[PDB]
Write a protein that binds this DNA or RNA. Sequence first.
RNA 1: CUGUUGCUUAUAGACGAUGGCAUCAGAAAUCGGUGUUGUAAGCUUUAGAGUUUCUUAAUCAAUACUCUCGGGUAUUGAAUG
RNA 2: UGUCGGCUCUUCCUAUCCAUUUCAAGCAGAAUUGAAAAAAGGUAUGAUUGUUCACCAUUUAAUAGGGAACGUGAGCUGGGUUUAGACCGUCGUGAGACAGGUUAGUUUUACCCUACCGUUUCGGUAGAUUUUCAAAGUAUUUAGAUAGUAGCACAACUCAGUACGAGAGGAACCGUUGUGUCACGCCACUGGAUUAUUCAAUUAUUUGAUCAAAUAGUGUUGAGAAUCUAACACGUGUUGAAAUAAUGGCUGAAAGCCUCUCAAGCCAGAAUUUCGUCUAGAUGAAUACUUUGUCUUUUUCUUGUUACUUUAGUACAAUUGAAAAU
RNA 3: GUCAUCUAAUUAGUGACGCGCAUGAAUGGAUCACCGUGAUUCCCACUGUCCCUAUCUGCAAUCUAGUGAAACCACAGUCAA
RNA 4: UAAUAACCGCAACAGGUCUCCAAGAAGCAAAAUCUUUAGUUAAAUAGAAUAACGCAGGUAAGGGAAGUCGGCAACAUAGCUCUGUAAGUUAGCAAGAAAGAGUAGCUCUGGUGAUUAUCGAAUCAGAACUUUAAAGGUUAGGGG
Lengths: 133, 387, 57
Amino acid sequence: GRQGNKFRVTCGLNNASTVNCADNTGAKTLTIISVKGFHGRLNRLPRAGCGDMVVATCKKGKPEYRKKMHTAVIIRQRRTWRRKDGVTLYFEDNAAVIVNMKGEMKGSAITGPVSKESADLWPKISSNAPTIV
Amino acid sequence: SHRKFEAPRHGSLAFHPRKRVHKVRATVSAFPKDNAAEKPHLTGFLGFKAGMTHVIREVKRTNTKLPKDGVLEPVTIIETPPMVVAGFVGYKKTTTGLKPITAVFAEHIADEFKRRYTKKWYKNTKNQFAVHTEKYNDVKAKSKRERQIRLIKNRCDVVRVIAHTQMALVPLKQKKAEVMEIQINGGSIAEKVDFAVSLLEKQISVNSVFGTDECIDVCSVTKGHGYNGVIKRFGVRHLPRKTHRGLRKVACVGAWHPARVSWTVARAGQMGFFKRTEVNKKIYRLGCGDLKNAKTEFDITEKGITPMGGFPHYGVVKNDFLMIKGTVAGIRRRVISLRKACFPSTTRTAQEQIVLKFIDTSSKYGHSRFQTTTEKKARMGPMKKDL
Amino acid sequence: QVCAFSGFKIPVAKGRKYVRLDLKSFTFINKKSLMQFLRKTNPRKVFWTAIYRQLNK
RNA sequence: CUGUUGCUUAUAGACGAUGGCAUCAGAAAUCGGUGUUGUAAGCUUUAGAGUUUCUUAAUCAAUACUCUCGGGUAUUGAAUG
RNA sequence: UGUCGGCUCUUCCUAUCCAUUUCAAGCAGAAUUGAAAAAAGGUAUGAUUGUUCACCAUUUAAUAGGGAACGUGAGCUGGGUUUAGACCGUCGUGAGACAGGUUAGUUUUACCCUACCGUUUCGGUAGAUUUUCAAAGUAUUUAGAUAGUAGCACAACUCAGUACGAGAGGAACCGUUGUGUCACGCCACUGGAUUAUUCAAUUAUUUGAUCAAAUAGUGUUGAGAAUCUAACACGUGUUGAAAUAAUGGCUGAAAGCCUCUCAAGCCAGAAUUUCGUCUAGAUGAAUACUUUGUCUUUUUCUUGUUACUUUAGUACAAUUGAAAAU
RNA sequence: GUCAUCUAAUUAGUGACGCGCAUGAAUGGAUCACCGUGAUUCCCACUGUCCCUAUCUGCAAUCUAGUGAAACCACAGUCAA
RNA sequence: UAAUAACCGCAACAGGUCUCCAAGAAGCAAAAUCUUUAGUUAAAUAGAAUAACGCAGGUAAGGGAAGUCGGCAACAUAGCUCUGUAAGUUAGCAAGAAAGAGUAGCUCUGGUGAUUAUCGAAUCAGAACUUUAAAGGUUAGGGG
């Protein structure tokens, strides 16, 4: 469901790295389990950047979402990453929105900004964003 | 048994053994394949690395997603003052490789070239190239020179010019010049020598060797790091904290029965002063004549390439220079042997025109803000000093 | 660009940008200015600031 | 001619090695350039909440503006003269 | 001969899991299935158990199987087993027994030879005499017998909702653009360390007070240049030619026809081999200056080499040695 | 073992079932509130334990002047078959 | 002498060996840290260079036990005042449960007594103003 070629973003989220939930689906935190498209290596934990589809389990939220494995996309991260035009930026906290494999966003709103790298990757997310940093 | 989980081996076997070099300059071990259907041309140079700085480059490529504003890229400033050709040498292909047939030398030899033949100049009688110079015009020693040329035109296949730098134009403390044999690639051997003889004693500038937007194969000697362990040298995994007799080492240096440590096992040693040749190093700006400054069409302030306070540990760049792309092997003041590429690149990046929107000349110490010292004084105003 | 706390003119490709959760983003010039901004330090009381130097004199 | 020795030698370095210079040497300060910190020490702004007094003034007073983009530091592995 | 497993690291086998090249299908497409060349590259993250094994949750192109004294303990760990304490269950009249269970239980030395990684010091290659030459010394520029080898893989746009197919579904070659990892670097930008005990502040004690410091083995905090470094910043390895393997073929006999050849002669075809390029490298070559012009041996001067010195002795220009190919 | 629960995933933990190879009543059976440098499991905070290693200080290590042992030792020490 | 050199340990061995006298700052404290009278600067040798691998002491981006047999090791809470404090229970305890607020500097005010206005004690409370917003140099509970 992604539309385009992601650039290099310094991944700052590991395995078992709790992120918030910018969605409005009644889920609070989703601890990352894996990362889709991760070419692994020995003794290396899966890394999630910005705009990287992950697979995360909800450990806090509504009962129909708790204790289940979902698929999310990281919209903002606290790890500084450098754009190609020489801009060095980082956000205030990590967050991720629940999507499906086709990219269809499960919620209907996003709280806070959205990183540009995760907006053009999934056109279904950029529409819901308040702003796109 | 078999290792439980397979991994990529650490370090490269194409560089073993890792023996540090002796001479600071890195001899170029191969020159581009000779093409016999073009005007003879030099295929190399020799410049002293000065440092690095960052530029904002306008993208001139097609079907790319890079921002239209600019892309921030690192460059390297290699100061190359003009070299002086001091002879030439003709090689011949035998059943044991090239065999230098003869070598013709110019008449007037600078004192920076004579020093290379001695190990203690202050006590040396400094009589190098004296008998050769004093008898240069004699008829007996003029027929010998004319004989050497006819030998090369008949029994030689490769002609190279023994060119040496000028050490009075660089801020280095060294005085003796660095000697390089730059091959001539072009027409038949009849016109190679006629080109080589025409170059004697005549300075050659970098723009007569390289061109704009040309990729080159820099050859140099890396940084010196001395004795280093196994973690730094090869990159093995550091052992757990509980380990007895230390952590940062390889644990098992071989299985039992071969009864010998393999040559492939990661061992301690001397990482450091090695020789490496990189390839496909794009040239951004050719600091010859008009482009010797750091101004551009977009930013038109007249500033030299030397940052505020000079290049650290190096000094001030005032002569001809290059703008390589990215990091070239070797610390500042190293002698870098540029060379025309042996395998020319055909990628769409290598054929792309380089348009520079900005070149950083701010200071390289601390988090400097201003670009030229004539604009720091304007923004900060008058100090207590000078007032 | 102009630094949020120090009020100095940022060069190109220098500085780090901080994006808050309330959609507002600031660009700084060094970690000295970013750190003093994250502690609610008032630039009007910090002498070297360009904001302070504009207020007086 | 090479080696030792010297610059408490660097572009190298465990020791050897390697690289530079050796009287146009080399070193040391000083003056600039370039950086780091944040306004030095002395007295003044009845700034200053109050107390004490002469008996209707001074004293003491966290902090605080002027001189102050001040002082201090800056090759030690930074660059000029 | 320190007797399980795991962590770390290297190499080897192919009975191949992925990537490359080909044949067969009950191969229309997509998916899959059987086999051939091929070991140069890669083959994961976790919950429970001491576990090898096992079973699950994911991810990837694939998460293939094995050997090296069941690789690897003066490499580690000591979870189990496998001493001495203690408890339970069964057995035994009793001491006690139990591949039954639970808990606590010291892991010694390398400074030796070799191996491997690096690093020095002394020695050295035999046939050359157009003085425009030849040889030795010192130094520079080169040369490269041999040894190693490095780049792989994925994804997106276009191809294209096209070929195929009734429909459902549904690819590919050239081209463009990025990512991951491995290797080699590198210090501009961004980040980290920081006894420049740099600058500033401050807690306790002591210099009568201010200034200036000192002590708490670096008192602590904030900023912090230099240098080091990034799995955290960023560059290079898109790089060319020839010949091959499985297989597909051309001309073509044997065998008047047929056949790619267990025939002569050729072409196309691999992540293959060899040149090219990269790193280390021995015998060498040219030039510069000092000499020597037949000759060595022994003593002897130097940090060491060459030239040099003395007394000797030895021959003195003149008939040798090439056809190639079949 | 089976069934619930814990986790994305549970030979582990807890709660129930009991033809219990071989539990069971001063060889004491059931029950634990407080207490324990006792045994086991899961949460919150915290962190170089780990992803993934980077850097700093003292003492050493290296070289040097003086002093200066011990374990061990058939003879010794390059490989393939 | 009565011990990091006179005793016992093969010795000028970091081990062991019964007692008396006891200053200031600071605190609740004979705690940690600094000083006065007293003792000593030598107690198995030093200089240079600032490599690896070490012993001892540290710090760190983003994530926070994914490492491992196991949170081993390390990090984090910590003094005092006020508010509040569950299930269970042998009715005593659990309990410092858990959880939250305050704390500096300077200038002031009031309360707590003896003798008939003077004199003496550290202790508690409250109010302005300022700053770098305050137990944390040292000592100093992780909780369920």
